[model samples]
Target: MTYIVSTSTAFPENYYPQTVLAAALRRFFTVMELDFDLEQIDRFFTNVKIDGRYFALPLDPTWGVSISRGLENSLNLAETAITKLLEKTNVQPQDISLLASVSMTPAIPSLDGRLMNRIPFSSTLKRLPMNGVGCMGGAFGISRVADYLKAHPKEAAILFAVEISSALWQGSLQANLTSLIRRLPENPSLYSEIIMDIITAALFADGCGAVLMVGKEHPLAKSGLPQVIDNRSFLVPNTVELMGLDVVDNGFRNILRPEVSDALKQGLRPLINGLLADNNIESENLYRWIVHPGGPKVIDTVEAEFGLDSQTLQLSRDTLAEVGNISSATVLYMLDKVLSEEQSPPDSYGLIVAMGPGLAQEAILLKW
Candidate 1:
């Protein structure tokens, strides 16, 4: 398959900083709603070293919207992004042979319906349904679609990934007494349980995004953006509880183990080699590595494991620092940055990889 085209990205309207979240939680607990103690959360932040997080949740558009509404917004963005992709490829929606969706949020399916209507694509095309591939689903989803296209040849497919993590933070009210107890075991006397619930509620944040991928041999496929050359996957069975998205009250839950990085380092080298061999490429030859930067740790582990000097990963690191992981749409976000330059012409081999739940990793070999 030949490398094709890609589109730009759109961020959220309202942006929140880590400081604001801390202050808001503190104010809401002690002064306003009076729920949890601020000191404890402060302690967690100090330990995490994450200054603050940003959200793509509704801001200029409004404070927030329901999951259904969020899905609508994501679909709207997808429509725009895909339109741009089509423009870049010089193709139409009807040119697509398949549609695959990767997401952890937005359930109404209303968004997909809207997508069906907006994309001038055919009614008979196929669809792949996926749930919570967590942050790496984008790469996972695209590879699956690409493989399908390779098998079908001349048949085009659309790999579309949409993530509305911020909306998940619309976050139902919580009674995380456990979270409170866990974070402030020594400070139980400082704030009441109710206080903990109120304060914590304000601190949590969320975001959303979408991407478009086309298969080679598709009428719209091109040669400059990038193509699927090879991929690798690995999973740590017992680590299922390590990192995952949980279902909390108002929205969803993010449960990540500190060992996520540890696991990646332990698993990446072998997986990288195996996948590279599948495509007949070597890691040393990879000029660009679009590894999913779930966090600073993930990047560091990959760097150390491969002993690769190019921090070509800052793109991912910067995205993480800019907006905590964007769930499944994250990897696609990374691709957007790498795939955008018009000057990076043909035959360049790049490796794209993403790790998610299933305690698994999804990797792909992309070539121009």
Candidate 2:
């Protein structure tokens, strides 16, 4: 069994409101022929329920700076987050048997190895650096590390998501937006798509999160953090276009299909039901849900699909509002928030779920 021993998170000091960010993006996306009203972009950003988000650097009216600095900020933030995790759990670098670094932001050598270099670890320390999973990277990291603990049942592992979504805010997005604007006169549907993606850019933000897990037999397994009972991952067929990032020399370009929430709503129930049935658990047995707030629409879809009231997803929504979507780090932030609150009843079960590009879904059944 794998037990979550502790969690820690870090955000860059610079925070900006939705209106401020929208204005900055407007300055970059200005085109005389654009069909959409740029002034109204703030409304769309606000509708995501995000009041503001942190950034590695303060917003400049005309910004494309992070394209070159993505690696530097990501690594620095990763170090801060991982350092906090170690101090929070009172664990040493060498004590970690495995390290799983999850991120979608581009980097060479990745954080896992670079981290080992930043803070020397045991020569035998195992490292797994993950990328391309996008927003689902956090849950995927937790699930994979749990699977590892099943084999190395006497060890400890660290799972961290360092997503500097701000770093991806480079020339590529503006280039795409400019191209879309030039085409708007010919294609209405394409205009709609581009606007939606622009709203996505306004909402998604940056954060880094880390969690420590110990094998059941380890001494720290007795900590108050929840233990992983099992995890499930599902990939929808031919839905790769639903969400992803395009890599280019300039930076990352986000591709988000408007139907993502619908696809998630369609796929979630049966998969969740099957998982519960196999575990001899029922829907009512779940004490709480730590669902990723992909966006306001996704959260609303989840609440409707699961027959939950507003309070059922209060934490998820709160996290979204507090820091927007932190990509893979969002779910970890949600989980940490839930865990930090007044402890739940002993033996209570929590469902932690997230979705990403492959139209993939990952759910971890956690027990306190």
Candidate 3:
């Protein structure tokens, strides 16, 4: 068994209200000469329910036109988050025997090795950098490490993920559309294609999240964080186009499909029911739900799918409202909020769910 001993998160200093972001995007689309409805796009931003968000780079009213394309912003976000985790847990770098680095955006040297140089992880630190996991990295990162520690029960691990959505900003919607048409001629959803980037511009933002884990017998397991009972992953076959970062020469582009909510609803039953059945538990027995806030509609779909109580995902909704979707890092932020409230009683069960590229769903069973 493995327990999350501590968790931490960090966001860039530049914060912008949703309206401010939408206005800036309007100027960007107009300047780029894209055929789009600025008012409708702004409405999409409002409907997403995010009041504001942080950006790795400071927002320029000119749509952050000078945003740099590289790892510097992502590095800053990750370093800030991991530094706080080390301090909170009072653990030195060398004490982290295993390192799991998660990121969908490219980082040249890899955060695990980069952190080891800046921080003080032991020379023998075992690094497992899981790149391209997209938003599911949060739950999957923990699950993968826990599976390892289940065997090496005496070891400690740290799982970290940083997504620079600010850098992934698509510069031109028309350019994206032309590329999409060239790549997928069979798809006739050009209007939907245009809406995807517009929503992404207003809805996506930057942040980082991290957690520390140890085997159940580790000394710090007594700290009382939620214990990771088990984790399960389910893939929506042949649906890779549903969600992922599209690598472009300029940088990463958001490939979020408009069909995501429908895809999620389709997969929730089998993915969730099988997990609960395997664990000898039922949906009604879950004490809390720590779901990934992919978007307002994603949250709504999950609630409607399971017929969950309205308040079951309040914290998740809070995270989305306070900060726009930070992809994989968002789930850890939700978990951090739950941990801070410290509301769980002994043996209370919590479920962590996230979906990302691969049209995949990840579920982690938690108990306190």
Candidate 4:
């Protein structure tokens, strides 16, 4: 049975970076007068290769609206994104037997699962809410549902990775205090983790999605996006100290290590060619790569290893440049672009991948 990716995307509102998130961090550290080093802040910003980041830090209707309010707003935006696509694909919630969700931001009952209350979904559907996957959220979410369909072979599924990373922005955590500071010499990442343990920041704009994967027998199967060929997961076990997110009282926490790049670099290196080789393909055989923009260095790893031309990893670069890693929505957001823009011959092969929480990678192969 063909497990086709039907429809996908998030909202259209451009959450342009107004304060220049990196610059905001620098100034926050300077003003807070917590003995933040200017050079270290400068270095950290340079390393992320991010001048700024977008946030759904939208103007609230009321000044005192809570994070819950923000989630609903983004949820509404997500509804708009999916409304037309679902119709075009002739999919409804009742057809979805499995519903998986990924999130690490503000929490409540899931916007997608709860979407049934307003939309029309079967009450019997399975709801899998995954957290703590870090940026691996969406890819992991999709992989899980794909795994489901592989087993069920008859059930249909919808996966949504919704995060309002912008909603609960703590001005302090956004600064270089501790999270990036611990990556400094002689300071010990433990110290950085300590701040990370207590605070939260370095988030992106809001995004949510509805991607329906249906079994071939169901109608509307012919004109789907890509068929999931096969996918795999791997881990760099010794690197648990690298990155993690925390649930703070205010919002979320981001724990990252500078060594994360180096560790994943070595880890991702050996796996890339093996994945391609296992699929009985060569680098030249593949048409497109859908890789998560974990950050700047992550993309660099792909480019350096593949000796790819500038255009090769442009999707990854463009999304990171445009949206700053919308966590689980990151790769799917790029995939949306691929399905929308790219011209490909029939039966073209592509790879989709995201590396996260396990300090691990989920590598997927797709065909169009």
lDDT order, best first, reads 2, 3, 4, 1
- lDDT against the true structure, each candidate: 0.63, 0.82, 0.80, 0.66
- List residue ranges in candidate 4 displaced over 4 A: 12-14, 30-52, 58-67, 106-108, 171-203, 248-251
What tens digits encode model 3's per-residue C-alpha lDDT throughout 52-142? Answer: 9988765541223423333666677778888899899898887888989788765566778877777878899998889777888988898
Residue pairs of candidate 2 with colliding backbone atoms: none
Query: Candidate 3 lDDT (Cα, whole model)?
Result: 0.80
Relative to the true structure, candidate 2 reaches a TM of: 0.94
TM-score for each candidate, following the candidate numbering: 0.81, 0.94, 0.92, 0.82
Q: Pick the candidate with the highest lDDT.
A: 2
Error of 1 at 46 (Å): 7.7
Considering TM-score, where higher is better, how would the candidates rank from best to worst?
2, 3, 4, 1
Candidate 4 Cα lDDT to native = 0.66
Error of 1 at 327 (Å): 1.7
Q: Which stretches in model 2 have alpha-carbon errors above 4 Å?
A: 29-35, 61-68
Clash-forming residue pairs, model 4: 138-328
lDDT comparison, 3 vs 4, better candidate: 3
Model 4 — which ten-residue stretch has the worst lDDT? Answer: 194-203
What's the residue-level lDDT of 53 in candidate 1? Answer: 58
lDDT of 1 by residue, 1-368 (tens): 63435644555556676666656545535543433445766654443334445554542222245665776667766676667767766767776767777766555563555588877678886777677567677778777776776677777655666666555335443234435544555665634543434323332334434445555555556655577766556786788886676666545555565567887766787888888877777788887888876666677778878887856677776666666566676677667766664245468778888887867888788787
Compare the candidates by TM-score and give the number of the best one: 2
In angstroms, how far off is 103's CA in candidate 2? 0.6
Model 1: lDDT of residue 201: 36
